[PDB]
Design a protein around this ligand. Structure first.
Ligand SMILES: Nc1ncnc2c1nc(Br)n2[C@@H]1O[C@H](CO)[C@@H](O)[C@H]1O
Ligand SMILES: [Mg+2]
Length: 390
């Protein structure tokens, strides 16, 4: 009579990393890609012979900086003249050009100079997320829910839909990232009455705080606040500056002018930073870092916490601003939800918990996966077509 329907997917299309999930058998499965990664870099690289997307693109970025595109989400639905775009362009090694006051990324690809709209680069990331899901399900996927930041305007939301259509996806709905994180915890399924939820999202490059009110499963965004210049990369920069100084003291050598040595140092720092989230100390072991000198050292969690102390404390300023804008007191918040890999930092958790007088934080769903988790829950609800009984 009626053939079984393919599962719909939930995609968190992130600035730095993207994540895909599917709700099946009453639960969400976050789908690992072919390299065993549960998140995929939102990177696209172009060469004379190939277009590489995800881990393959991010792994060759060092020697191909001009033709490896990342951060397309910072350009999507914006005008070339927009002050945000103009400032961001100084930090990017790839070219951003002006086509009718719309930004386009220009690269060398398959023997030619090619320019792409931000939605086209995002469609390439969505194509990879769709293939990751089809590799797991074993059949073609058509339907998806895609998430966006709560502050995205109409043009930014329509360009995200356009990226989905280019990728061959039927976009069921564009939903806000803080709403998707709330849905992941079933915070819209608690019945009658108003609930105030604070979502604390600390990413690779930006920090966002959102206050939502939920009444009978209906979501209302009450306040948004954040810091565009606060993220995981700033903590990596503090460790980099620390070890450059340490090398200078120990071997009387300044490494800061050899890009490879700085890159190898930064790569090792980011991994030590992750180790320090579950360990009280971490080893740093780099062979022939500079002038054939082996750099074998360590860092305690206490020293790392001291190095980033001002940055961690500054996450509380947008929390207080969001609470003032929502016209609420901290005691009136019912649920605290953590989003982003940088929220695994014990000191970040301790500061926020202390601010809310020892309250529990919802962190049981991996914070780098919560948004895709909620998007997958919503995607399964949106494709239901039940006919009422008599
Ligand atoms: N366990 C973790 N402890 C500390 N930081 C982490 C962890 N896992 C992830 Br993922 N990160 C950081 O989150 C950001 C995501 O773009 C990057 O800066 C990652 O370094
Ligand atoms: Mg995110």
């Amino acid at each position: 009579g009626s053939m079984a329907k393919a599962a719909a997917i939930g995609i968190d299309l992130g600035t730095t990393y993207s994540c895909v999930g599917v709700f099946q058998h009453g639960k969400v499965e976050i789908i690992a890609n072919d390299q065993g990664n549960r998140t995929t870099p939102s990177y696209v690289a172009f060469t004379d012979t190939e277009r590489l997307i995800g881990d393959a693109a991010k792994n060759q970025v060092a020697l191909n900086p001009q033709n490896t595109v990342f951060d397309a989400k910072r350009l999507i639905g914006r005008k070339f003249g927009d002050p945000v775009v103009q400032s961001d362009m100084k930090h990017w090694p790839f070219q951003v050009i002006n086509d009718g006051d719309k930004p386009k990324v220009q690269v060398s690809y398959k023997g030619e100079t090619k320019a792409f709209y931000p939605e086209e680069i995002s469609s390439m990331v969505l194509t990879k997320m769709k293939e990751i899901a089809e590799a797991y399900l074993g059949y073609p996927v058509t339907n998806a829910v895609i998430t966006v930041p709560a502050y995205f305007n109409d043009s930014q939301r329509q360009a995200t839909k356009d990226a989905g259509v280019i990728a061959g996806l039927n976009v069921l709905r564009i939903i806000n990232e803080p709403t998707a994180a709330a849905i992941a915890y079933g915070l819209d399924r608690t019945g009658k009455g108003e609930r105030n939820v604070l979502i604390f999202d600390l990413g690779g490059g930006t920090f966002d705080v959102s206050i939502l009110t939920i009444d009978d499963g209906i979501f209302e965004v009450k306040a948004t606040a954040g810091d565009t210049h606060l993220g995981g990369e700033d903590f990596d920069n503090r460790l980099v500056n620390h070890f450059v100084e340490e090398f200078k003291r120990k071997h009387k050598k300044d490494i800061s002018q050899n890009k490879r040595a700085v890159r190898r140092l930064r790569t090792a720092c980011e991994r030590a930073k992750r180790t320090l989230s579950s360990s009280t100390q971490a080893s740093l072991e780099i062979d022939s870092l500079f002038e054939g000198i082996d750099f074998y050292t360590s860092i305690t969690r206490a020293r790392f916490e001291e190095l980033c102390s001002d940055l961690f404390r500054s996450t509380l300023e947008p929390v207080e601003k969001a609470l003032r804008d929502a016209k609420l007191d901290k005691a009136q918040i019912h649920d605290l939800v953590l989003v982003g890999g940088s929220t695994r930092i014990p000191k970040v958790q301790k500061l926020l918990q202390d601010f809310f007088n020892g309250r529990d934080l919802n962190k049981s769903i991996n914070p780098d996966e919560a948004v895709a988790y909620g998007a997958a829950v919503q995607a399964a609800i949106l494709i239901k077509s039940t006919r009422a009984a008599a």
